[PDB]
Amino acid sequence: SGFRKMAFPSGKVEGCMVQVTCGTTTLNGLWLDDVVYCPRHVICTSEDMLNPNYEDLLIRKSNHNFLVQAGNVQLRVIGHSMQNCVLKLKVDTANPKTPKYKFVRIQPGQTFSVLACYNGSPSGVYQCAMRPNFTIKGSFLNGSCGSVGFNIDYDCVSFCYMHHMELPTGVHAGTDLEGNFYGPFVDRQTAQAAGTDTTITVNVLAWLYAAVINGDRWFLNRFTTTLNDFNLVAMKYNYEPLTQDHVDILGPLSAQTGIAVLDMCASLKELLQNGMNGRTILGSALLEDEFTPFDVVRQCSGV
Amino acid sequence: SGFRKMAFPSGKVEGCMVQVTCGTTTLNGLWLDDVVYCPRHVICTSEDMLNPNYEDLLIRKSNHNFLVQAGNVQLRVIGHSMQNCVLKLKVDTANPKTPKYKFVRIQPGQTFSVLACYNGSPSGVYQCAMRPNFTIKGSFLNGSCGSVGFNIDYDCVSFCYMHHMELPTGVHAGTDLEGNFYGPFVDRQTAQAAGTDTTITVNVLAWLYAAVINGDRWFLNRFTTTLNDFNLVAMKYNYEPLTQDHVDILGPLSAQTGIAVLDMCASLKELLQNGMNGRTILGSALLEDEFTPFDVVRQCSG
Ligand SMILES: O=C(N(CCCOc1ccccc1)Cc1ccns1)N1CCc2c(F)cccc21
Numbered sequence: 001s002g003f004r005k006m007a008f009p010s011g012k013v014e015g016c017m018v019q020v021t022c023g024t025t026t027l028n029g030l031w032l033d034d035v036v037y038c039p040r041h042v043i044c045t046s047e048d049m050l051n052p053n054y055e056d057l058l059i060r061k062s063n064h065n066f067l068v069q070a071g072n073v074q075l076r077v078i079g080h081s082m083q084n085c086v087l088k089l090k091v092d093t094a095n096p097k098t099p100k101y102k103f104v105r106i107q108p109g110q111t112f113s114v115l116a117c118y119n120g121s122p123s124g125v126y127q128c129a130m131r132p133n134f135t136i137k138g139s140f141l142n143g144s145c146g147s148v149g150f151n152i153d154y155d156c157v158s159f160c161y162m163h164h165m166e167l168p169t170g171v172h173a174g175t176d177l178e179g180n181f182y183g184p185f186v187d188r189q190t191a192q193a194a195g196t197d198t199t200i201t202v203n204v205l206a207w208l209y210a211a212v213i214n215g216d217r218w219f220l221n222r223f224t225t226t227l228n229d230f231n232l233v234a235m236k237y238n239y240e241p242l243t244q245d246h247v248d249i250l251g252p253l254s255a256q257t258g259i260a261v262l263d264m265c266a267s268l269k270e271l272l273q274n275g276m277n278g279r280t281i282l283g284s285a286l287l288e289d290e291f292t293p294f295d296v297v298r299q300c301s302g303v
Numbered sequence: 304s305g306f307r308k309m310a311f312p313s314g315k316v317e318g319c320m321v322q323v324t325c326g327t328t329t330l331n332g333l334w335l336d337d338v339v340y341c342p343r344h345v346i347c348t349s350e351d352m353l354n355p356n357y358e359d360l361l362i363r364k365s366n367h368n369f370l371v372q373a374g375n376v377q378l379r380v381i382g383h384s385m386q387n388c389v390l391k392l393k394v395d396t397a398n399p400k401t402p403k404y405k406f407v408r409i410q411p412g413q414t415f416s417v418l419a420c421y422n423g424s425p426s427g428v429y430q431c432a433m434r435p436n437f438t439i440k441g442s443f444l445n446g447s448c449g450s451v452g453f454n455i456d457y458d459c460v461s462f463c464y465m466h467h468m469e470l471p472t473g474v475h476a477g478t479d480l481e482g483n484f485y486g487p488f489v490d491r492q493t494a495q496a497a498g499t500d501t502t503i504t505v506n507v508l509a510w511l512y513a514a515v516i517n518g519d520r521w522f523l524n525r526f527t528t529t530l531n532d533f534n535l536v537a538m539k540y541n542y543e544p545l546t547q548d549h550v551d552i553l554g555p556l557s558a559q560t561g562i563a564v565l566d567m568c569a570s571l572k573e574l575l576q577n578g579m580n581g582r583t584i585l586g587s588a589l590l591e592d593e594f595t596p597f598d599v600v601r602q603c604s605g
Pocket residue numbers: 025041042044045046049140141142143144145164165166167186187188189190304
């Protein structure tokens with residue numbers, strides 16, 4: 001019993017965090033095998049950030065202009081290249097703590113754990129969702145760039161996010177580990193702003209299934225809905241469209257609980273209309289959208 | 304920017320988690336040097352749990368009654384003893400990944416990270432507070448017993464909690480690593496209930512200071528209160544009394560924001576009475592009480 005925002009155990013990632021310095025700029029890098037990955041803006045001054053030409057900034061650098069520290073130990077850089085918005089530093093030592101890993105690009109609505117780091121030293125771990133507007137609602141201060149997001153499956157770490165910047169609303173933007181930004185954002189100080197965000201409907205439905213599994217049914221009703229009528233209503237509350245794919249993904253939870261997906265949809269419609277009337281669902285007074293169907297299954301009793 | 308419930312990185316503790324089996328009962332243990340710590344109820348059958356005589360149940364056990372698995376590797380048990388409600392198994396191998404550590408007992412209102420584990424295998428990490436009623440609002444299924452709570456300072460792990468049981472309301476109870484329970488609970492399956500809980504006032508005020516630091520300001524006011532009048536309100540709404548010590552601990556945040564604690568109390572006083580006026584504070588439609596003043600400073604300025 002209980003239901004918590006739970007992160008993956010972070011130890012496999014902790015052993016990969018290093019500090020990268022170029023000039024007066026320090027941030028975090030990810031040391032896997034003999035490569036360190038970090039945001040390419042490490043090669044920029046503050047002045048450079050308005051209109052950087054990364055090709056021109058990088059060609060002026062030699063390997064020894066990059067200082068990489070792994071705990072107490074300096075790693076020697078013996079090569080560098082840029083891939084999209086990520087700098088890849090070849091080092092002369094393979095990380096002996098490299099876990100089984102892959103690089104994955106996630107889609108909006110997917111969750112991951114973030115290891116927030118400063119000066120190559122891990123500070124804290126929390127769970128995030130990729131918002132529909134391609135931002136994350138993290139907790140990051142100056143010095144956090146190059147902190148990573150990940151999932152773990154068996155003993156395999158799937159890296160999906162690297163932190164690059166803060167937007168004016170206090171949310172965060174970054175790239176996959178191939179250096180491609182999530183969303184329309186750029187590693188340039190421009191007037192970019194987060195789009196108006198929306199609620200991740202499939203996740204809210206998963207979390208309502210979690211509430212049922214943990215023994216709460218107060219919010220159900222005697223109605224059903226068509227998928228189209230559900231979407232017409234939900235969109236009036238700035239909820240994401242629910243697709244047939246989402247309905248399919250919810251099948252196992254439907255089966256475990258005996259509540260048809262469109263019957264849970266009718267429940268959600270009524271919750272948006274009514275509020276909670278002084279009640280809570282899994283300890284929350286609002287509808288939670290940062291647990292995926294997978295996350296509910298992961299955490300909840302299968303009974 | 305941003306404000307998130309954050310756990311400590313768990314790697315130092317991951318390297319200490321093992322599986323302990325006695326008969327048909329399997330749960331998690333903590334392997335530090337050549338000793339494995341786990342709940343003593345591992346020595347019980349389901350029948351024994353109704354009215355266990357732990358003294359007798361342990362005397363009847365030998366080293367050979369215990370299996371300890373560290374990953375793929377069986378550790379041989381070469382000694383056993385009990386300290387309060389914790390079983391200590393001496394093993395033939397010192398854990399090479401033992402961190403610098405201490406055992407500390409925490410106070411209600413204090414926070415810690417939990418590494419939730421099953422079959423000696425870490426599955427997830429989250430942040431908890433020790434509630435005033437000495438329970439924790441965790442997330443634990445069968446097989447989680449022996450999962451631990453901890454804080455980290457520099458390179459030193461301070462272990463403060465070991466999971467023992469679930470209560471009927473779905474909250475959790477356990478011990479410090481010396482086997483002393485938090486709260487008026489016993490390791491027997493008999494009728495037990497969480498006391499009516501109360502809200503950790505100093506933590507709510509800390510979180511209101513966090514909201515101000517993150518530019519959430521709407522609940523500030525000109526109008527203020529006394530400690531006495533505030534505490535009359537606190538008592539009405541099942542909040543813990545606010546002490547002068549609490550007021551002192553919040554001093555940094557008072558200074559940073561220009562908002563006196565008793566002015567923030569009047570804000571909180573209005574929120575408990577008048578409510579939240581449709582609104583949210585840091586994305587919450589409840590008053591959050593599981594961030595300490597230290598946790599806010601740690602995350603906002605660090
Ligand atoms: O948002 C930030 N910074 C760093 C600002 C200083 O950037 C620099 C950059 C280079 C040298 C010295 C200083 C503050 C953060 C808070 C929490 N997370 S990152 N950055 C860093 C990268 C970036 C962009 F490419 C575009 C817009 C903003 C930003």
